[PDB]
Amino acid sequence: MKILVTGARGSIGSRVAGKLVERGLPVRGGVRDLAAPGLPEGVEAVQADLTRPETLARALEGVDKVFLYTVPEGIAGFVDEARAAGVRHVVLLSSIAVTWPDADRDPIGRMHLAVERPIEESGLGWTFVRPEALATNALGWAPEIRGGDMVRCAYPGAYTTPVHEEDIADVVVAALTTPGHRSAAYALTGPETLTQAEQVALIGEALGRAVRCERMPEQEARAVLEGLYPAEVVDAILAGQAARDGRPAEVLDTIRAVTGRPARTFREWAGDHVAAFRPA
Ligand SMILES: NC(=O)c1ccc[n+]([C@@H]2O[C@H](COP(=O)([O-])OP(=O)(O)OC[C@H]3O[C@@H](n4cnc5c(N)ncnc54)[C@H](OP(=O)(O)O)[C@@H]3O)[C@@H](O)[C@H]2O)c1
């Protein structure tokens, strides 16, 4: 029976879809707009807008399993349609922020908990995949790295443990295709905790040139982030980074435990995405 991959044009969703197609599995790729390009080959395109959960009734026909992105505003509608269609297993792309002690006050933590909890209460089989910082967050430095050798960082000494999107897709695929993952919640990290400055330098090494952070003052960083995210989220980002300033973050072996392969390094990630950081 079919697997519905929501967000099949997304960074993670497209890799989940592609990997399932490589395995011979019938995949429906969920998109908000059927007219647009970017869907991997061999995927049946279906409208599946998680904010308009009446699209889901058609998208879930003949579907046994679902990969789900976190969209809190339509979760009760999703649960209802998944139950009605006979879905047996939902794998959710959540966040490690749900595991920290302030999760239910943190905007990011709350956003993901608002989808985890109704799934937990629904009776559907589930697996939660809970990454720490996405390696792809480094793509926000591309404009500065393309144009010069200095990047401006709010907290150059702040640690995260960035995880490669391919590893996330591999864990999702394991959860969709093998037994033993029911009610599992996998906290995913990369294999090394790294500061912002270290990440920037590793991008430099992949390019063959020395790229450095300079610190920007918090006034300036707050302003930049207030143009990209709501007020509450900027406060959490900066507070999160200040709390990890000079404090190495936890490295978990969860990727290796699930997939049998060590987590991909940020260096490898930078080599994989090197074209994003070269000038036009
Ligand atoms: N950034 C971090 O450090 C971090 C850490 C932990 C967890 N996370 C989680 O990872 C996510 C990022 O995943 P990603 O890298 O794959 O992002 P992405 O490349 O931006 O893809 C996001 C996908 O979500 C889909 N989507 C959004 N709203 C939808 C809706 N209403 N209905 C259907 N599909 C919808 C989009 O579909 P369309 O392309 O069709 O529009 C898009 O394909 C975050 O949202 C968060 O939940 C992030």
Numbering used by the authors: 1 to 280
From the paper:
SimC7, which belongs to the short-chain dehydrogenase/reductase (SDR) superfamily, catalyzes reduction of the C-7 carbonyl of the angucyclinone, and the resulting hydroxyl is essential for antibiotic activity. Our results reveal that SimC7 is structurally distinct from previously characterized polyketide ketoreductases and, importantly, lacks the canonical SDR Ser-Tyr-Lys catalytic triad (Kavanagh et al., 2008, Kallberg et al., 2010, Persson and Kallberg, 2013).
To investigate this possibility, we determined the structures of SimC7 alone (apo; 1.6 Å resolution), the binary complex with NADP+ (1.95 Å), and the ternary complex with both NADP+ and 7-oxo-SD8 (1.2 Å).
